[PDB]
Amino acid sequence: GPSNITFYFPFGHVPTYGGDFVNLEHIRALNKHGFSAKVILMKNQIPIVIESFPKDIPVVFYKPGMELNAQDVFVLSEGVRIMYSGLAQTQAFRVIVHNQNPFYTHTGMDSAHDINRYRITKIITPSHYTVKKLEEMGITKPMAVISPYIPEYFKPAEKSNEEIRITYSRRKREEESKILLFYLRSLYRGKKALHIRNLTNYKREEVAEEMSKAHIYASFAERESLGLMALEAMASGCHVVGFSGFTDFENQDVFNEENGDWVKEGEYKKFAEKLIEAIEQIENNTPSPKIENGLALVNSRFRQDRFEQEVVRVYQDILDNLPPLEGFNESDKVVLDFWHFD
Amino acid sequence: GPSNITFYFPFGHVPTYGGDFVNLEHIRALNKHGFSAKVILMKNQIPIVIESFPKDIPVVFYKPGMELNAQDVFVLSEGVRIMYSGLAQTQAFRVIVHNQNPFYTHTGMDSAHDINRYRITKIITPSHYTVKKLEEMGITKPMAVISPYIPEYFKPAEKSNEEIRITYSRRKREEESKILLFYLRSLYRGKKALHIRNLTNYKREEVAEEMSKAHIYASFAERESLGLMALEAMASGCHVVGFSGFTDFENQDVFNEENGDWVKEGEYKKFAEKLIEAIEQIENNTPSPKIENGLALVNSRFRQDRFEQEVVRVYQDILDNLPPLEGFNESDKVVLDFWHFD
Ligand SMILES: O=c1ccn([C@@H]2O[C@H](CO)[C@@H](O)[C@H]2O)c(=O)[nH]1
Numbered sequence: 001g002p003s004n005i006t007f008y009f010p011f012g013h014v015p016t017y018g019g020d021f022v023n024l025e026h027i028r029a030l031n032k033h034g035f036s037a038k039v040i041l042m043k044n045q046i047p048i049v050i051e052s053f054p055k056d057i058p059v060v061f062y063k064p065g066m067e068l069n070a071q072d073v074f075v076l077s078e079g080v081r082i083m084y085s086g087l088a089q090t091q092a093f094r095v096i097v098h099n100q101n102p103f104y105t106h107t108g109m110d111s112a113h114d115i116n117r118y119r120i121t122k123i124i125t126p127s128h129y130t131v132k133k134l135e136e137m138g139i140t141k142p143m144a145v146i147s148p149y150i151p152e153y154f155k156p157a158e159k160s161n162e163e164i165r166i167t168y169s170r171r172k173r174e175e176e177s178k179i180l181l182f183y184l185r186s187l188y189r190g191k192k193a194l195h196i197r198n199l200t201n202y203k204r205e206e207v208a209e210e211m212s213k214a215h216i217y218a219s220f221a222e223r224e225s226l227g228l229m230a231l232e233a234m235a236s237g238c239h240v241v242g243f244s245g246f247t248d249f250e251n252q253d254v255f256n257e258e259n260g261d262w263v264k265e266g267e268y269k270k271f272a273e274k275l276i277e278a279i280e281q282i283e284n285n286t287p288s289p290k291i292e293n294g295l296a297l298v299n300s301r302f303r304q305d306r307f308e309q310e311v312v313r314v315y316q317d318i319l320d321n322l323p324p325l326e327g328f329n330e331s332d333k334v335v336l337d338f339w340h341f342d
Numbered sequence: 343g344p345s346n347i348t349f350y351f352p353f354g355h356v357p358t359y360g361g362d363f364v365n366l367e368h369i370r371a372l373n374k375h376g377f378s379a380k381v382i383l384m385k386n387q388i389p390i391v392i393e394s395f396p397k398d399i400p401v402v403f404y405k406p407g408m409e410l411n412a413q414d415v416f417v418l419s420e421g422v423r424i425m426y427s428g429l430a431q432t433q434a435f436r437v438i439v440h441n442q443n444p445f446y447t448h449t450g451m452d453s454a455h456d457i458n459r460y461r462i463t464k465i466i467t468p469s470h471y472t473v474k475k476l477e478e479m480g481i482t483k484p485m486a487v488i489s490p491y492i493p494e495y496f497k498p499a500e501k502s503n504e505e506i507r508i509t510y511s512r513r514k515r516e517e518e519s520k521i522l523l524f525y526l527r528s529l530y531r532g533k534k535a536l537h538i539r540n541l542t543n544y545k546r547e548e549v550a551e552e553m554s555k556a557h558i559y560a561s562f563a564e565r566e567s568l569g570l571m572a573l574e575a576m577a578s579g580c581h582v583v584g585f586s587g588f589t590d591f592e593n594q595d596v597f598n599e600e601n602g603d604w605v606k607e608g609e610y611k612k613f614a615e616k617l618i619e620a621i622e623q624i625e626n627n628t629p630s631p632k633i634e635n636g637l638a639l640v641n642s643r644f645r646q647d648r649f650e651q652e653v654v655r656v657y658q659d660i661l662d663n664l665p666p667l668e669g670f671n672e673s674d675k676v677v678l679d680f681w682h683f684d
């Protein structure tokens with residue numbers, strides 16, 4: 001029969017980081033396809049925060065003393081340590097971890113050993129690379145992959161045949177972007193001025209607008225799981241040049257020599273050189289084939305329809321393999337009073 | 343006859359960064375060996391700042407309207423842009439740049455072209471690597487090397503045969519030190535507890551004390567010119583494990599496979615493994631030969647006597663090759679009024 005299970009995704013703030021938005025996308029796909037998924041808003045139950053969740057995202061407020069069903073599932077971030085310690089206070093529920101930031105695993109958990117000994121049913125990740133990284137850290141829990149998607153509003157528009165536009169972000173490696181720009185100013189001896197635009201405090205729709213009009217995206221990616229902004233750029237028809245976000249580049253099989261002009265750590269000269277090459281490919285009308293390769297990568301592997309199919313497959317596979325509750329029956333009510341937030 | 347030249351080293355604050363202290367060491371060596379060198383304190387002429395210069399460092403206060411001799415030399419940092427723009431207001435004096443931070447060249451100067459066109463006589467650097475880096479950026483000015491020294495108070499003391507002590511710094515790569523420690527906690531399955539000590543807000547003499555008593559220095563060096571803290575560790579008899587500070591490691595010929603257990607960017611697993619190996623070399627009394635190699639490197643190449651000889655050689659070579667003044671005679675007085683500081 002039906003599972004009678006709801007998946008709860010904890011929040012404590014306005015959705016802000018990429019990971020937050022991906023979680024809302026899991027919720028939407030789950031509810032669209034016959035599951036039940038909700039935000040549990042742990043704290044900061046105030047207008048700006050409440051109103052920040054679109055109306056199609058069900059929200060339940062945490063209040064000490066509220067009840068859930070013993071069979072319900074919490075889908076925890078790798079961050080927020082207090083959710084793990086809180087849920088240790090009961091043998092009810094199940095726990096899934098959606099680890100979207102493998103290098104920030106330390107914020108939630110002290111070691112691989114603590115993860116391995118916790119009652120985690122499955123770790124969902126954004127990429128095959130993430131699975132390998134968590135395994136390298138010594139985590140032995142079962143893992144799954146659901147790759148985020150790039151919204152359809154990321155797509156090429158008209159790019160100026162007169163003015164070449166380079167976009168970048170200072171979200172990561174801000175100091176290194178200054179080093180790079182010094183090398184670029186120093187090595188570039190072409191006659192049209194460089195037009196550089198910073199996409200740092202923009203909303204995602206506005207990022208898409210800017211990328212759609214830009215020729216080149218200079219990548220300052222760092223310790224990525226997948227590399228959303230480089231995929232966004234590719235989806236927008238930008239030539240991506242710079243850091244891949246993967247020191248151990250061989251451990252990911254998304255980015256390759258044919259879809260970007262990637263450099264290794266500290267290769268500022270080569271980065272600047274490849275930017276100049278990318279400008280000249282435009283000026284001399286000798287386009288990089290990497291643009292089309294990138295477009296095809298995103299359109300094949302990172303759009304919404306496939307994402308929804310993977311959400312359904314992965315979460316259904318979890319439901320199908322839960323063991324019976326121990327020490328509870330189905331739809332026993334369990335009091336949640338494990339947190340008291342300032 | 344005598345040059346009748348003084349070298350002026352601008353300061354605006356308490357000596358703080360390594361580079362500041364190296365400059366005081368140039369001043370001391372110059373005055374010890376028959377030259378004239380002084381701090382010019384540009385601003386912040388207040389007790390805490392004035393008293394922060396040891397009594398053997400001559401200090402002259404900048405006051406708009408003061409006079410210097412037309413032949414005098416300014417030894418500018420690669421930073422502080424205002425010193426370059428100020429000194430552009432006169433054809434008097436000469437300029438040497440002591441570039442101790444090649445990746446921060448952008449703070450003082452916009453491009454290689456601006457450096458190449460400025461009236462810089464010579465760029466003094468801390469390392470052969472720095473020269474190569476500045477050249478790769480397209481700077482064509484003549485260069486020299488004066489390697490800083492490690493004070494004699496960095497030397498081995500008694501290290502506990504019972505408790506193994508790992509030191510590190512969070513000055514650079516703070517987030518990565520947390521990633522590393524997660525890997526170390528996760529992979530280490532030896533029985534004595536790890537003893538980790540952070541040397542971040544310590545005075546240099548206190549760093550030396552701690553290193554003298556520590557078995558291992560875990561290096562979080564980043565975009566170094568030379569790598570002072572790794573040399574300090576080596577001088578103290580510590581086994582150095584971790585990041586070298588040089589992505590383009592082949593462009594420096596100080597650190598090598600025989601004087602440290604170096605890893606490449608993102609190699610947290612190997613870093614943690616090498617830390618465990620270093621612990622076990624102590625526990626099983628199978629010491630790394632890298633310790634002795636490091637000691638010999640520092641004692642041969644990075645102590646004070648050689649430093650003083652290089653100061654004298656390099657600065658004398660500059661004096662010997664200055665062209666006659668244009669538009670001034672020797673010991674004409676020039677008014678300095680180019681700055682007005684808040
Ligand atoms: O100004 C910006 C820069 C980045 N991002 C988003 O941040 C995510 C990367 O973590 C991507 O989805 C990217 O569009 C924004 O929304 N706005």
Ligand SMILES: O=c1ccn([C@@H]2O[C@H](CO)[C@@H](O)[C@H]2O)c(=O)[nH]1
Nearest residue numbers: 360541542543544545546549570
């Ligand atoms: O607490 C600390 C850490 C580092 N340093 C010094 O910072 C320099 C590296 O830039 C080295 O000389 C090192 O001893 C200190 O003085 N104190």
